[model samples]
Each structure stands twice: as structure tokens, then as C-alpha cells.
Target: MKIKQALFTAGYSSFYFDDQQAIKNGAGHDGFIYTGDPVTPGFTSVRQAGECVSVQLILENGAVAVGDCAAVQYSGAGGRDPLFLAEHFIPFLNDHIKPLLEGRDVDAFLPNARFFDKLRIDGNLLHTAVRYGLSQALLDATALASGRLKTEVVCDEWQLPCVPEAIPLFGQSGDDRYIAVDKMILKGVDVLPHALINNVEEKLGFKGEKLREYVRWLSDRILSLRSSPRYHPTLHIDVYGTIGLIFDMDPVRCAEYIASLEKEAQGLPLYIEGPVDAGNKPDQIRMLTAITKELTRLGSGVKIVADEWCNTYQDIVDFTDAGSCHMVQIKTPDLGGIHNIVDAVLYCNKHGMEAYQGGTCNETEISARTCVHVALAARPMRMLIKPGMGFDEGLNIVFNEMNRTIALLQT
Candidate 1:
């Protein structure tokens, strides 16, 4: 089937565009919103309702294929594309995108995705959101035209084994980390309570004792409440660079602190994400590599998962190449085309690094649903429970889609 026309609609994402700087500087919360001035570039406030662009591909048969264009929550702070406002981008998409999308066949998903992924105007590539969302539409178009599930298209194109099990889902807990872990526990989530450790003094503690205590509490909570003997969920916490802060960027000290966290996790394994962000890519890799080396030398089992500067397909490759961390987060939207996500996961797995098919809470059903198929095809070590911080809704959106996709495949 050929693309009849491309239509763009501006909309909202699953979460807000938060000023990461303001939040890190201790912005008070106002019940799901922040109470402070914005600091990050392009943010109008400390927290603004996130915006999205649903690029709809109307095929010749009048069926619509949608891909949501969304930026991450802490948009501009982490060397990511600036705030992706719908109003600012719709016109940009109209002149450049609508034309190319119209007289095209949707059968070849990866090449088509790569073609659009590499599009350039005035020496600049498309924004990550556009590449992300447009590739989704392309994938959806191929799946719709071919009358196959998205995962089927991916597996056939990528030559991946057809694994018919739901990828393990990792849930992120917002500020309500306590209650959120309970919810994940009840559901027996594979990974529990991301426990937004973005702040240093408040959340992670100046000397890191607070996080250590929380890990103990987290382990005890699970052990005491679990009804099943086999309910062993991994403990993964994202500090958003707080660990590097308190330890003054000393890899040995950081590794020691994280080892202490592993001890507090009792018998469960621990993965610390973005323990430090060295402002840029090379330095970030060096610092994380140093930390990983320290952990290895100390015989500590705590795995360091790289985030922050590891924001794109190349970043993941670079991180994997450097052995920067034990795991690399395939932060979906930042990598532009969904196709790159596929590449990143496979690359990490081939290089002995764990690939995490993670995305932001600041996305929509389109992204969350699309991500399920990617996880199914690529078979990442784990996938995220996303589009929201609330454990239940995110899990509902991600797990049901994954299960339904698997059910159809098994048939």
C-alpha cells in the first residue's frame, strides 16, 4: 500500500516536561506539579504539561497509522534535543515531512525508517522526536499494509528469533516511591520502585546513608510481603548523577558507596543507573568506566547502568565499546528512529552488555505500544513500564500490549 497523505496533529504526552535543574535545586512539589521557576532551556515553567506530535500516515485504504513525537522529561538539560513543542514543530513537519511521506510504499520498514531517520535539511538531522514518531508510523504502515503484527515485521526484517514470552517489565516510581513499590510488589513486577533518586540532599543523602537505608527497607518490604517463594525482583535505582555528586566524582568512593547499597539490598541484585553524568559523552564514559573498574576490582556485584550522556544509538555503541557500564539504557525517544533502538539493543547484546529497552514516562500510548513490539523483537534484558510513574497504569499499558502481542504471535 502507498502512503496517501501525511497529517500531523499536536497533542499531549503521558507526563510533563520538567526543568531538571529546578527539580535538582529542590523545587517543592505541588501535588503532581512543581512549585518553582523554570531553569532548563526552552522550559516555560518548572513543570509544563508535555506536548506531542501524532504524525498520522493515511494509507490509500483510508486507514491511519500513528506515531507519537515526544521528548523526554528532562529535555534540554542532558544534551538532548530542546523542548519539542507541538506548535513550534507542526509547521516544520508540514513543509519538509508531508511531501516525502505522500508518494511512498510502506512495505520495507527498516530501510524506509532509516531513510527518514537520516533526512537532513541545512546540515541538521530531524529532531529525535520526529525521527522517533515518523519511524513508528512507517513501522505501523508496513504492519498494517502487510496485515502482520509489528513484532512480526521487526523479527522478519531483523532476523531475530521469535521468542514468545513477555519481556520483563521494569517499573519507575515517582515521588510516591513507598506506595509505588507496594503496588509493584502486589503485581510481582520484575523490577521494582525506580525510587526517583534525582535529588542529592533530600533523596540520596549527603553521605549516601539515606539511599542505603531505603535499599534495606526495599529488600525487607519485598521479603516480608511476597506471597510466593520465587518473587525475587531486581533492585534498580536511578540516582540521576547524585552518586557522583556526593562522592565528588571519585570512582573508588562511588564504587564503595554502591557496594554498600548492594549489601543493603540483602540477597537481591542491584543496578544503579546514571550514578554520575560527567557533562559530556567522552568524560561520562571515562567516569563510568572508572566506576565499573572499581566495582570489578572490589569484587562488588552492583552493576552500573549508563544513562545521561548515553542518549543515542551512537552513544550506546560508544558506551558498549568502552565497556562504560554493565548495562546501557536504550532510552527510546532519544535515539530518533525506532530502528536505531533495534540496532542499539542487538549491538549491546552482541558486545556482552545488557540492553534495557527503556523510555520516558513523558510519552503516550503510541510510544508505549510501539515499544512493546520492539522489546518483543529485540528481546532486551528488560523493558520499562512506562508512559507514567504510577506503577499500575504504566504496567497495564506495557504488559497488556506485550501479552496480547505474544498471544497473537503464538497462534
Candidate 2:
């Protein structure tokens, strides 16, 4: 590819919502919407009128586009300085995408991803999002170039069983009381199976299959919700770094829990998000690697996917290449933006790895759309389309609109 021209768009808007604590506390950006929160301690932001700026892209072919909203609006210190997000990463991306994408005949995906590695060296929180957003646009363009579904270019084999999406509302108090999941069930997804929900302490009173029975009951509730005419979607489970190949938990008890969830997840596969708690070591990558091998040996075509341990592209590349994980979760903003995520997925596919799209609590609809696009692009089975469901209303509404957009695209 040579050089052409690129266009950018920026806009601002305000959002309003109901104050039902669940609406405000549940997943979704602002209240009402069901996307989860990426950044913790901050939910349902009521941004001042001045807190608005949106960006869009246009290629030489005049194909207009947009980047992931997962990219933090304001970079650094988590999501602190809005000015820095605009001045530094956002503007920088507006400038960077033009030359690299203008007239370049999209050839190898790696070169496109390499462009991201260069930016990552500067690597701040905001830069990460910029890097990610650019990568997503590039991949979208690449799919357009190949005249194939963007996902085909990324994965050789995929298992897409409907759009596996759900709203993960933050709990009200403690780790147990989650922001009500009832509303999320109405939004399609209806499963809550985090590691803590099934922690040994939580299951202490029960023994043998009784503990297992309780877990199954929760699964049944999700199944009932999903089967309802109101909304039927896949259930999701997270280990939150709790389940692992090696951990402090009693081996026999842990084995029972695993056996229990596995048996309970007969029809619906339990999506195990890492660390998988092999150990409290920096070798989260290594820990997951071993777990996947064990699962493969267990002779169940079941799977162990990764999240918390996935810090960068190299992590997925190394782990998936070694067969540590069957699926890698790509959160739009967490890896900086969609661009970096694309690089990670491409690398995974290149190494015979599989993946799905995901995000941190800090995501907005912008980022959620990116997750959907990546899933559409990567074509993963039962993708985790989390948009910080229990976060802020602004983000929740964006995710809602994006969901509508996805519907339009499907049609």
C-alpha cells in the first residue's frame, strides 16, 4: 500500500438516565444500559456539558469508520486526564492512521501490527488505547481489502454460536451482593458464575454433591432466564484468577468444584476466564499454560480461556503458542485499544490460537462496539461482549445503541 488520505471526526453530546441504583450500579456505561464498568469505584458518571469529544475516521476510498470506545477517554492514572486523552493519544492517532493507511496495499497483517509495537514503546494508559483503536481500524480495512469477513482473516477455525453477550453488573456490597442481574437477563445474557460465587468459603456448609448442586441451581436460574421468551442468550463464567492448575485450595475439593461446574455446564460450556489461580506468581501466563494442558488431558473438549493474566500481545503469543489457553480474551481498551487487540488476535491465529473479544470495567459503548466488531471480525465461539455493564450510564447507553447497530449490520 502507498499513501492516500484520511479523515477524522470529533463530536460531543450529553446523556441522562434513571437513578434506580441497579440502573446506575449495574453493568453498562451510564445508568439504564447494561454494559459493565471497566474502571472500578466509578459508576454512572454524570459528565458535565464540557465532557464530550468523539472521533471518526475516513479512508482514501471514502469509507468512513470509527475506533473503539474502550480507549480511555482520558489516558494515564487509569482514566483521569481528559485533556491528555484528547491532546495526546486521540490527536496522535488522527495523525498516525493517515500515512500508514492512506494508499498502502494491505499485504501482511504483521506489518500492520508492527506499527502498533512502535507506539507501545511510548506506552502510557492513553497511548495503549490509541494503539488499540488504530489497530482495529486497520484490521477492518484489511478485511475490506481481502473481501472476506474480517474474522476469517484472523482465525482459521472458529465456533460462533450466536453472539455470546451478557450484562455483568457490579454488586452492591461485599463481593457477594452483585448489582441485580435481573435487568441484564432482559438484555439477553443471564449468567453469573464468577470464582468467588463458588468459593470454598461460600460452599463451606455444603459437601459432596450438595455444593455442586448449589452451583447447578445457579446455572439453572440462568438457563431459565435464557429460555424465557423475554431474552435467551448464553451464560458466562469467570474464575477471576481463582481456578487454576495449581492453587492453595484443597486439591480434592478443587477437583470436586471443577467436576461439579463441568457436569453442571453439560449443555452450556463454562467460560473460564483466568488467571485460573495456578499460583500467585508473575507467571500467570505459565500457570494458564499448564492448566490448558491439563484440561486437554482431562479428555473433555472443554476449554480454559484467559483474561487477567493477558497483559500484552506477547503474553497471548507465548501462552497460546504453547497451548496454555484455548481462547484468548481481547478487551478493547485494556490492551490500549482495538489495534493492539487486533495484533494479539492475528498473532494468536497465526500461532494456531483462538480468541474472543472482551474489555475492562473502564469501557464505554465505543469500546463495546469495538469488541463486537472484533468478534465479528475474528469470528470466535461464544464471544464475551462485555461493555462494563454495571459501570456508567453514558457508557451503558452507548453500548445499547451499538447493540442496535450490530443488529442493523446483521440484517
Candidate 3:
């Protein structure tokens, strides 16, 4: 019924933190490491080991509920919090957070979650990474104490209907676009291959020819590999704003290019993530809105997803209100607490906007597992198969956890 002890351990995250600004400024890779100066403060190199802190709540019955504190991949750029270091956070957790949790009752989730999720030190909210993994530990503690699945605790606490159906899994293909996608199709992924189409010079092509050809190839490959005729997956690509670079930030031209991608998609649904990273939230919304209008004028249903400047629950609502994007990515870690992720999804759906429950590949299994509870309870349009870029490893973690928890909830 109570948390007996709170433990903190320095740890490594699934992926590395990359300097987004440095990479954008032509930071070519020297093997795995980038060979350019980091433009973001707090970063020593263009890419470095992502560190995380492990939060373990040992319950009175000797059960431990675990969570890992981690930040987004591009920690400093994209308006995210500074890079999270395990050494820095471990001491804070042991000194400040351990005292708060050691004597707490694990009877209910929201009360404790809200307190910690909103807790500030010296007038600033705890680092988003801290609140994120802390919430996970609290939620799991409540579930373990109550003898229920994490999904049930959320649905019961939030008064949400727990649909026992599968949340369509979205898999990203990293750079292994060809081979990894073969695995996603084999697993019957609902959203296929977020082909990392970041470079306008190479991946997106000078005139966007490479991406156009790839969409056609995706359609053909899905057709070629499906064991069942019923396995038609939506094509989604994250260009990381290369589309905008190619057209010189012209919304009209961007829409036309997306329309061309639609043609190449061969009637499959297409979602393009961050077509343009417009430097700031207001400008990003404006450019996306213009592109949306152009797509409508061109009679194109190609859905534009807002990712770059849409970082918070408020940002999601703003994008939804402006109709700036067809889909808004509820980037989990950036939102700080899991509760924010739940609210963001519900708000977007209630206001008639599609929500994609997403987080970076630079996370941990505990974080990804925590997200599954939110996805099932809140019911997003789609959720990412995450923690790492590799297809099969994350697939096992996310998919099995969802199925295992759903089965327990049903019984």
C-alpha cells in the first residue's frame, strides 16, 4: 500500500542526443559521430551518449515499479529542455525526490502524479525528463498497489472507456528504409516506414525525386510483401523539413510537391511529418496553414503533420484550432508528464483533429511501456513503436507489452 523505498541509478538511454542545429548546418558523420561544431549550448559535440536516470519505487510488498528519465533526441533545439544527464539528475532524485516518495501511499495515481508533475524547484518546473519518468514510476506504483494493470488505473481514474482493441502501431524505418520496412510489413504495421527523409540534397533530392520514387516503391513493396490482401498500411514519412528546403519555403510549391507524392502513393493514405520547420511556433503554424489551404485547393488529401514547433499540450490545441496540420504528434517526453499525453490526445480527438501518440527513439523500455497504458486508455489515432530505431527490438517491447496488459485487463 506504500512505497517502501525510492532508488535512483545512473543509466544510458536507447539512443544518442543529436545537435539538430549542427546537423542542419551540414554536420556530416565521421562514422557514427558527427564532424561539426554543436550549435546548441550544453552540447559538447554534434552527438553524444544520451544519459538517463532509473527511478525504482519499491513497494511494501517488495515489488519494484520502474521508470527511466529521458529527454528528446534533439534536446536543446526544437525548444526542448537541455540535455538530460544521469549524473546531474541522479543526485537531485536521491536528495529531493526520494524523500517525497519513500513515505507516500500508492492508493491513487492522479493526486501524487499532479503534485510531482507540477512540482518546481526554485520557481522552475522540474526538468521535463524528471517529471516524465517520475510520473511513470508513480503510475506503476499505484497499479501494483491496487493490483490492476496500468491501463485500468488510468481509465478508472480519468473516467475513460478502456477499449480492449489494439492501437495501430506505427514503425519508423530509421536509415534502414529498405530492410526495416520489410519487417514492419511482416508485422502488419498500421503506419509504415517513417523513412528518415532529412536531407534535401540527397534523400529528398534536389527536386524531391528520390522521395517521390520511394513512395511509389513503398506502395509496390507493400503490395509485393503482404501475405494477406487485407494488409494495406498508410504511408507516413518524416522529412525533417527537407520538403520546405526544396521549395525554398514556398507553401504553394510544397503543397504541389505533396500532391505529387500522393499520386506516387498509389491511392494509399499519406501523412507527411514536419514538411517545414518554420523556425518558430507562430510561423510554423502559418506556413502549415498555408500549405493545408493549398492542398485543399489542389484537391489533395495528403495529411500534413506538425512536429517541429508543436512541443506542448497548449501547442497541440493551438495547431488544432488553426487547422495548421491534419495530424499533431503528441511527443510524449517533451510534454513532461504522462498525464499531459493523455489530455493532449483526448483534446485533439474531441476537437476533430487526429492525434499521434509519439515519442523519440531516444527513450527507454519503461518509458515506452508507460506510453502503452496511455495509448490504450486515451485511444490515439496511432502510436509509435519506439525506444530505438531498430524495428524488431522495439516491436517486441511495445507490441508484447500492449497485448500482455490488454489480456490482463480483459480478464
Candidate 4:
């Protein structure tokens, strides 16, 4: 059960994928896409590639498992460069982490994994992507040792049921965002279409008339997606805290503005994410609580989701306890490991708040598929498609993995 060897390598993402309507990451809005790293404000075109880390762990008995590392940091918010992270991760694994894990029992792997997270490299904890990579590798090895599906391992370890149906969320942006969703709906996939409006004020100017016009466009586009009777349409929008910036972070004003769009939503399932960034975690909780209460008082049904500040398990618990949001995007990478994400979801369920196992498009197929196993086991409200630019690539990987994992688990 010991980890005999751990290997790490640098990797690259497929392309700079973004919300369909998102403005390019660069200054000119040319042909580039934003990496969603708020800290490192840069853009990458088709020629350039986003980075990642690939990890492979070999057990003493010659069994091997793989994991990939990907984190989304906005403007130096929570992540560093992949190479920098991998640089420290390799040595940390060799000098400190390896010896502790080499002869450990596989069944007790989760506790060992938790203990490793407490140690730091050069006075700072390992980057979330590094932790995600290593923890996923540990879980994969655990699954191998038990000869069970990764989803089964999670369920057995966490004491949860295996939910066969894992809801898939799709990105809606660009010119054909609705068209892409229609195609999936035709196939009976219960797709959650998400749009990012963070760049709207920048593109259209920070004027009320322009914001109103954009809202109209959004409403019309979603209404056009009323084709499939088989799918339950949930309109998800990520404002990326732009609403706060536009409205001067006024809770009452933000709620009023959101209520104005309720009529346009037409009673569909609407979840608004990151509507306001209150700077810190406490302020974020306070603002979100105010917005939710105002929306409730106004009889608005929009679900306010906490994203930017709710980056970890404790943050999720805090937001849930304070009634700050209707849902929390358990940004999987931010929590460092899928196991922690499971705990987050369980905690949310206990508190009667919805949890969305969300991640960035900058992720890899390995990380995305691993998230699928997690989603199936934990049964989050919905899971975001990742590691791909277009709809088909992410859909194929997740759908295929779900099928394979379910088949293996049933046997």
C-alpha cells in the first residue's frame, strides 16, 4: 500500500476557454481568451497555451494511478503559475511527503493526506493545484487497492450513497451559446446553461441603459432556448463580482437591480453567482446575506450563489451558517482535494444549502473526469464541465467517465 514513487511533469491546457460572450483576456479584445486568473491579468491566443501539472503515483506492488493539477486564480487572488507550483511540489513530495506516505496503509490514506496538507513549503502551503494533484493520486491509489470504482471509494469512505445521475452544467456565451445548449437538450441532457456577465459593463460601458440592454439580450437569448421539453432549464449566470463594482457594492441597490431582471427570467430556475465581491470573507458574507434577504422580501426567486470569497470548506460552512447565500460553488480546486469537496457538500446538505461542485475551464481532462467521479459519489446540485473550450470536448469526457465508472461500480 506504500507509495513507492511519485512523478511530476509540466502540462498545458487545450486552449484559453471562456464564457461564450466574455471579452478576450488581452487589452485589445483581439483573438485571445482570458485564463480567469484575476491576479495575473493576461490573455492567451490560439498560439499560446495555459499550463497545468501532471502527476503519477506508483504503489509498492507496481500499481499506478494518475492525477492532474489545475487552478483558476483571478488577479493574483488564490493561485500562482503552474511551473512555480510544480517546482515546489516536486521537492516537497520527495523530501518530506514521500517518506511519510511510502509505507502507510492504503485504507488510512485520507487521514494521511489531511496531515500532509498541514505542512508548508517555504512558509506557504502548497498551491491548491499541487494539493489537488497529489490528493487525487492518493484517492486513485486507494481505489486501485480496493479494486473498486473511484466513486465507490469516495462513497465508502464518506458514508454516502452512489447517486448515478450527475447533472451536467454547460457554458452559455459567445455567438452560439444558446445553439450549443439546444443541441445538448435535443439529446435529453439536463443542461444548466451558465453565462458570465463580468465583462459586459466593460464592453458596453458602465451605464445603466447599457446594462439594461444587456439584460434584455440575456433574457431573449435564454427564452429562445425553450425548445426541449425533456430538459429542466436552469439559467446560471456568473457576474464575477461585477455587479458590486457597477453598483458601488450597495446591497440594496444590487438586490433592486437583480429584481428588475426577475421578470425577464420568466420563472425559470435562476442562479446568480458572484453578484457582489465584498472584498473580504466577512464583508462578502454580510453583503450576500443582505442581498438574499432583500431578494426574499421582494419575492424574487433568484438564488444568490457565493463564489469568489467562498474558496474553502470553512468558507462554505461560514456562508451557510450565516445564511449568506442560497448556494455555494464548492470551487473544487480551491479546496485542494475532492475529498474536502465531499465534506463541503455534506456540510451544505446538513445546513440545507445547495452545493455546486464547480471548477474552471483551465482544468485538464484528468481533473475534469476525476471531478465527475466525485460528483457521482457526492451528488452535488450540479457540476460544471471543465478542461475544454468547446461543449463537445468536456461533455464527451464527463459523460464517458460517468458511464465507465457506473459500469465498473455495478459489477
lDDT of 1 by residue, 188-271 (tens): 999877899977887899999789889999999999999987999999999989999998899999999998787788889899
Model 3: residues with Cα > 4 Å off, grouped in runs: none
lDDT of each: 0.90, 0.46, 0.90, 0.69
**Could you report the Cα RMSD, in angstroms, for every candidate shown?**
1.4, 8.7, 1.2, 4.1
The most accurate candidate by TM-score is: 3
RMSD of 2: 8.7
| Predicted candidate 4 versus true structure: per-residue lDDT over 79-137, tens digit per residue | 33232234545666667666766676665447855865565767877777777877787
Look at candidate 1 and give me any clashing residue pairs: none
Lowest summed lDDT over 10 consecutive residues: which window, candidate 4? 38-47
lDDT of model 2 at residue 95? 62
Which sections of candidate 4 miss by over 4 Å?
14-26, 33-48, 73-75, 78-101, 168-191, 200-227
TM-score of 1: 0.97
Over 4 Å off in model 1, which ranges? 26-36
lDDT score at residue 399, model 2, on the 0-100 scale: 48
Q: In model 2, which runs have C-alpha deviations exceeding 4 angstroms? A: 1-54, 58-64, 69-113, 120-126, 137-214, 223-235, 243-256, 278-282, 289-302, 336-354, 390-411
